[PDB]
Design a protein around this ligand. Structure first.
Ligand SMILES: COCc1cc(O)cc2c1O[C@@H](c1ccc(O)cc1)[C@H]1CC(F)(F)C[C@@H]21
Ligand SMILES: COCc1cc(O)cc2c1O[C@@H](c1ccc(O)cc1)[C@H]1CC(F)(F)C[C@@H]21
Lengths: 219, 222
């Protein structure tokens, strides 16, 4: 019942992570990193509150959480940035506009993906409900392996899909449009995956992940 | 309008399918794969040019899409011909590799395991020959965001192929909840193809095709 469309969205709403203040006393990169580390703590809490997540094997939970974290941080960036073109509201005291991304090399490229991708969610007029579901789906779909308890993950993923389908339906739009809007939302996930990979490759070319693994062993 | 109709579209995409590519071999594994990709890229341009309306986008957008997608489209094609043989990757008619052979070159084993995992997830869903044709089209049309944010034309094209996929799934005869689930299941896979595409690109750029593609793209432009 807790996975029923209306209940599942309300459950996902309450599970939303709190505002994260980095509290600043290389640096842009220090701030971004200090934030990710803080956000990852709350992301674990969040996933635990998704009905049925905790009941997957700890193997799968860790597996999903290790491969999605970047996407899920990005999806959350996009969503709070959605109403302000040219900017990226990372946190309540860390708003960066595109050009501030020229400082650090390779980052301007990524900012432009996030901004482009945000722009597209603004064009589709992404709804608060739809976003709640999409984010859940990013986590549940983040790794293929734990799917090829697998029974359980498949059923969970279908659950959130149905909820998204349900959300779109009470939109009152025709059935052709319902399918199109489902398809348009899901194709954007390819682009969030994309920006996630760019940020990861870049993150590793730098001179959080270990801190995450610590949290994961703690989990 | 009508040439983009669900039925005509799928048949058109069918005929547009690239020919078999014989690599014809007289570091080496990576030499083969690279010579193959280069050959495949030629035919991929032809293939896109046969997708109704592709040619009637601005040249700028055609080039944007082709440069962004070529790896995913090549991988999508790999997965599809490999789909019935677990543990293997039929790259071409004279280049079948199995998981283990991926240990030779470093970094490649990780990629093979994504490709093989993704292929298994398409074998479990029982991907249909026409579902595949539509999906591949969508990978190209969805490969770049920028040309969408002629943009009118790309959106229309992208809706067309989607409708075709929905249509294909519909005559599947399954219920409506299942039709949605299967649309959703196919599309979430695209994230994983994107993903493997990115790992291959990164790995390719670390090595000592892309320039040869830009040459092809300039010739497509002239
Ligand atoms: C702690 O990780 C820091 C970091 C290092 C890096 O090399 C790349 C990235 C990094 O942070 C990522 C990030 C995304 C969302 C969010 O809420 C917090 C952090 C993105 C931000 C970025 F600048 F767009 C690139 C990518
Ligand atoms: C010409 O590019 C050669 C290459 C270099 C590299 O660094 C990485 C890759 C490469 O080839 C890619 C490829 C994918 C499909 C296809 O039909 C032909 C080639 C994949 C094959 C791979 F080995 F799985 C990794 C990735």
């Amino acid at each position: 019942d807790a996975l029923s469309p209306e209940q599942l969205v309300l459950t996902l709403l309450e599970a939303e992570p709190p505002h994260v203040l980095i509290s600043r006393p290389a640096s842009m990169m220090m701030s971004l990193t200090k934030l990710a580390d803080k956000e990852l703590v709350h992301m674990i809490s969040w996933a635990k509150k998704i009905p049925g997540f905790v009941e997957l094997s700890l193997f799968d939970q860790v597996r999903l959480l290790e491969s999605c974290w970047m996407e899920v941080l990005m999806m959350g960036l996009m969503w709070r940035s959605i109403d302000h073109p040219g900017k990226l509201i990372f946190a309540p005291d860390l708003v960066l506009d595109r050009d501030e991304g020229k400082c650090v090399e390779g980052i301007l490229e990524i900012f432009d993906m996030l901004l482009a991708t945000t722009s597209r969610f603004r064009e589709l007029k992404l709804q608060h409900k739809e976003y709640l579901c999409v984010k859940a789906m990013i986590l549940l779909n983040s790794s293929m392996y734990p799917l090829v308890s697998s029974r359980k993950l498949a059923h969970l993923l279908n659950a959130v899909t149905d909820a998204l389908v349900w959300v779109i339906a009470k939109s009152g739009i025709s059935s052709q449009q319902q399918s199109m809007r489902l398809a348009n939302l899901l194709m954007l996930l390819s682009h969030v995956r994309h920006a996630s990979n760019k940020g990861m490759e870049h993150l590793l070319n730098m001179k959080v992940y270990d801190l995450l693994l610590e949290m994961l062993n703690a989990h």
